Ligand binder design. Structure first.
Ligand SMILES: *[C@@H]1O[C@H](CO)[C@@H](O[C@@H]2O[C@H](CO)[C@@H](O[C@@H]3O[C@H](CO)[C@@H](O)[C@H](O)[C@@H]3O)[C@H](O)[C@H]2NC(C)=O)[C@H](O)[C@H]1NC(C)=O
Lengths: 35, 141
């Protein structure tokens, strides 16, 4: 592959071997509960 | 709320009999560039600005000089969070227009960017930015 166009999360483990781009959408982490 | 953001005809069309006027937009900073680049009609109408920072603008608003303030997100949120009683911003989850972020500016293509950036990613990774948020940026309301 030559590019990844997908919801890829930016973190320390990937930045050592990849040159990322500026984020295009900010997000966090939640949990799912049935209601 | 009274205004639906930058798409409301009140802002978009400054020709009302009751002309909701003079959002702060301290001149010759950053958001003024966005306003003057995208839609020139506010920038033409918008001349009753503030000559000082948010500190003077908030008291001017409280005194009734102007009824709307347009500025950054973090600083305005902090100002609203630290106040006697409360002055309410528009709907906060939707009050972040033209989303961006702070950062460090260096010289063009310097070798520090490789290390300081990864340090920042680490910092956001271990949660050490979080208790800084608790310590330095908090309010009662
Ligand atoms: C935005 O850019 C301006 C550009 O200089 C910054 O300075 C303001 O610009 C006006 C217009 O050029 C300047 O007026 C000057 O005033 C002095 C003293 O009255 C006069 O002798 C000069 O001939 C000239 O007319 C002035 O430097 C300044 N405006 C005022 C009222 O002092 C300005 O700092 C930048 N940022 C902001 C937030 O405005």
């Amino acid at each position: 592959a030559d590019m990844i166009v997908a919801p890829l999360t930016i973190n320390n483990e990937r930045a050592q071997y990849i040159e990322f781009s500026k984020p295009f959408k900010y997000q966090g982490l939640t949990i799912l509960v049935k209601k | 709320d009274t205004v639906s953001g930058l798409s409301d005809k009140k802002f978009q069309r400054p020709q009302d009999q009751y002309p909701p006027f003079r959002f702060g937009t301290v001149p010759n900073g950053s958001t003024e560039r966005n306003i003057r680049s995208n839609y020139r009609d506010m920038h033409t109408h918008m001349v009753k600005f503030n000559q000082r920072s948010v500190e003077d603008a908030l008291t001017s608003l409280k005194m009734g000089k102007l009824d709307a303030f347009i500025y950054d997100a973090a600083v305005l949120n902090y100002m609203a969070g630290k106040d006697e009683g409360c002055k309410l911003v528009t709907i906060g989850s939707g009050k972040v227009f033209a989303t961006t972020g702070y950062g460090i500016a260096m010289q063009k293509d310097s070798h520090w960017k490789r290390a300081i950036d990864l340090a920042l990613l680490q910092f956001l990774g271990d949660g050490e930015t979080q208790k800084l948020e608790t310590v330095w940026l908090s309010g009662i309301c």
